[PDB]
Structures are given as C-alpha cells and as structure tokens.
Design a protein around this ligand. Sequence first.
Ligand SMILES: CCOC(=O)c1c(/C(C#N)=C\N)c2ccc(Cl)c(Cl)c2n1C
Length: 332
Amino acid sequence: MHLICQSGDVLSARYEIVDTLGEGAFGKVVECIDHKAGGRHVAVKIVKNVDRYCEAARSEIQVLEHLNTTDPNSTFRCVQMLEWFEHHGHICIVFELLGLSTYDFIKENGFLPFRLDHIRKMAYQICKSVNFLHSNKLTHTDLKPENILFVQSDYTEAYNKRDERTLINPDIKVVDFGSATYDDEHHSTLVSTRHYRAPEVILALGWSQPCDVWSIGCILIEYYLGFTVFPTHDSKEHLAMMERILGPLPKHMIQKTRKRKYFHHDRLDWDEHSSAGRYVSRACKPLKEFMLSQDVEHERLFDLIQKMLEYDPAKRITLREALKHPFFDLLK
Ligand SMILES: CCOC(=O)c1c(/C(C#N)=C\N)c2ccc(Cl)c(Cl)c2n1C
C-alpha cells in the first residue's frame, strides 16, 4: 500500500494524488486532481490487495452502482461513486470529494460534542439517507461517526469551558458500503468488529435493517457527549454495558439465543467485581443520566435515542417512524 499512494503518483493515467484523506482497515482514501474532468478534485479509495477487502470493494461498487442509478440527483445523501479501476492490482474507487468524518471533526475539536441544533440536522439527514437504503432492501451494517462525512467541514472558533469549533454547514453524507447487505443475500451471522453492535448481532438472533437503527442511536449519543457510551471491544462487556445503560436484556431474547457463553441460568454471566466489571460500573449508567440539560429539546433527543436503543429489533423504531419524531419538529 505504501508503494502506490504517494502525492504526485498518477492513477489510471488520469488521477494525480495531492493528499491522503484517511486510512482504514480496507486501505486508504486519497484526494486527486482528475485531469480528464477539468482538474476536478475527487476522492479515491485505494483498497488493500487482500481477498477480504477486494471482495468488499467489488460489493461496494455493485451497491453504489445501484444507489447512484436509483438516486441520480443524490437527494438522499449517499456518497456518489464516479467510476472505479485497478492500479497495480488494487481496486480503486473514485468518489465525489467530501470533507472530514464526524469522528475526525470531534477528535480535532478536543472531543467536544456537537451543538444540539447541529445534531438535529445531522440526525435527520442520516435517518433520511439510511431510510433510503432500507427502502431499497439494503442494510448498511457499519454506521458509525467515522462513516458519516461532512460535505464541507469548514468551521469557526470561539471561547465558550474552553474554545470550540462550530461547523458553518453541518450537511453530511453516508459512506462505506463495503459491508452493506441486501435482504435476499447471505447475512454474515458472524458480524466482525464494530463500533456499535446491536444486541441481536451479539446474540446471533439474526439481523437486518433494525441493526442500523441501533447504530444510529449510538451515533447520536456520541454526537451529544463527544464520546461513545459503549467504550469496549469485548462482546460480553458490551452486553454488560447495555444492562447498566438500558436495563436488563429481555427474557425472550435470552431464551432464544445460542450464545450461551454470555449467560448462566437466565442472566448475563458477568462478574461486577472484576477489572472489566469495575470499569463498567464506573463508565456506564442509566441512559438519561447522561443528559447535559433537562430542557425539552434534550428530552426530545433522549426519547428518540431510547427508542432507537430498544433491545428487541422488531419493536425498535423504524427510520420512517424516527423521521416523524418530535425531536425533528423544529426542522419542519
Ligand atoms: C476510515 C477512513 O476512511 C476515510 O478516510 C474516508 C472514507 C471511507 C470509506 N470507504 C470511510 N470513512 C471515504 C469515503 C468517501 C469519500 Cl468521498 C471520502 Cl473523502 C472518504 N474518506 C476520507
């Protein structure tokens, strides 16, 4: 990868690398001048020449071809692919250029949270975008702040606690369709590492579009706080955190699951006095205690978040319903 993505490199006799925009598991995204499109700047996703990742890239290209034909005006804010090609055996996907991810923005802003008015706008766009995927028999599966990109991330700075950066325009798009799965496709029952895994994913109960809703609830809490309420990679710890924040797992889900490794009799097999246990007790608390204000717009936000973090994926709010929530009435 190091060998093919340096500034000044030309890809496909067309795209001149001017900068690296980011790095992920899949490889790297670079900013290029498109010399056959009048010098337009584009993003180019450079994928690792590794089976797993090439496969995911071919899949993302098929999804994006479908989405971009279905929504040619990008009314629903999914990243627009321009074309793709191969370069020294690596799959390269060309995208309209976007700005900094929401994750990166929070990081470069000292983990300061977004202002509620910006959260409302961003939440609405993310809901409408992902609802579009849901309407086309797709599940994203990997929604997280790192996969939500600002269209343009210019900001202003002012003293508040501390100095803060505030977006001038908080418009976003949804990116990374390398994990997106169609309804009639084989669903990975092993879901791999994810920022925010839904309980039905952890418990191998089956997953579909509701698992996106769960992730979006988690995104919204992270936007409001500046940090995730589930600071863990471990699946049992994650369940332990869920119980602290959201209450006990429903009996009916515990009864159904084959993941008996997490359970002992009817209850989570969790030692509250272990290292991980003590940390969970410190780091997690009931959802609504995370509120920074009791003001009604905060209550509106937290009501939506709680609905998105409903354990049972059948009962969980759909995006179509979330779009009609009171939190969004100010945008009407
Ligand atoms: C995990 C880091 O990925 C990115 O840095 C990233 C990514 C990806 C992917 N795939 C995910 N965050 C981008 C997708 C489309 C566009 Cl237009 C841009 Cl600019 C993208 N960037 C910068």
